[PDB]
Amino acid sequence: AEIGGDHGYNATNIAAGQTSGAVTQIGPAVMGMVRRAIPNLIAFDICGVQP
Amino acid sequence: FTFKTGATYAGEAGYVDREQITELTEESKLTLNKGDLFKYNNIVYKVLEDTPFATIEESDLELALQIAIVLLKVRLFSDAASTSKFESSDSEIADARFQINKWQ
């Protein structure tokens, strides 16, 4: 009669793996990284260039 | 842990049976009789000779109990359950528990 438990849903426990149950998981897997998008240039046609 | 205790929870010892079994205390060690079970440090024992701890002068109980085993006053009750124990449809069947902790 053994309990698997849940993390407290506290973001502190879930990241450490603390668990009320029998097992403390290694950690929170990974779902991948979310970067921030690189915003766009307006290019230079709007103004004469002349390198 | 299983390996530290020295006690057997699956057998004629049982677990819920260890409730009705009376621990050794300085008062209770005097009242033991032949065939009376007792647990100390959760290791159940069985009394071979009535009024054990009559000739044993050790005030310290842990070692007095430990020199009863060698003088065969009380044996260790690790013992296998007679088959009729688990068939009664009321059966306390020993539970086996684990815990998994990480060291990070």
Side-chain angles (χ1 to χ4, degrees):
Chain A
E2 187 169 2
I3 177 69
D6 60 352
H7 306 284
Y9 291 79
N10 196 32
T12 301
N13 286 341
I14 309 168
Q18 178 71 257
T19 298
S20 67
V23 180
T24 58
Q25 299 83 2
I26 294 169
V30 286
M31 288 192 286
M33 185 170 286
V34 181
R35 186 188 292 271
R36 179 63 62 75
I38 292 169
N40 290 336
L41 305 176
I42 197 168
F44 295 104
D45 186 14
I46 54 177
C47 56
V49 176
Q50 290 180 333
Chain B
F1 300 158
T2 60
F3 61 90
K4 289 181 177 180
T5 59
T8 62
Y9 290 87
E12 187 67 18
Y15 173 74
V16 177
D17 189 7
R18 293 184 184 277
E19 294 176 351
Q20 292 178 334
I21 292 172
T22 57
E23 290 181 349
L24 282 182
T25 59
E26 292 302 324
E27 292 177 349
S28 180
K29 61 180 291 182
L30 301 178
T31 58
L32 297 176
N33 294 336
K34 184 176 174 64
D36 288 341
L37 301 174
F38 63 85
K39 64 176 181 293
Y40 180 71
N41 282 336
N42 289 336
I43 296 171
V44 62
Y45 294 86
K46 189 178 177 64
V47 175
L48 292 173
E49 181 177 1
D50 59 351
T51 307
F53 305 155
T55 58
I56 293 170
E57 72 285 4
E58 290 297 320
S59 65
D60 187 5
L61 190 147
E62 178 179 0
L63 196 146
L65 174 60
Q66 179 171 348
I67 73 174
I69 295 169
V70 180
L71 298 179
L72 66 87
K73 270 69 179 181
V74 301
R75 68 184 186 88
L76 283 77
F77 187 63
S78 173
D79 195 358
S82 61
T83 56
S84 65
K85 180 173 177 288
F86 298 105
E87 297 172 347
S88 61
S89 295
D90 181 6
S91 296
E92 296 303 324
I93 181 176
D95 186 1
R97 297 177 63 186
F98 66 88
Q99 180 175 352
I100 302 175
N101 296 339
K102 78 172 71 176
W103 278 261
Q104 183 168 351

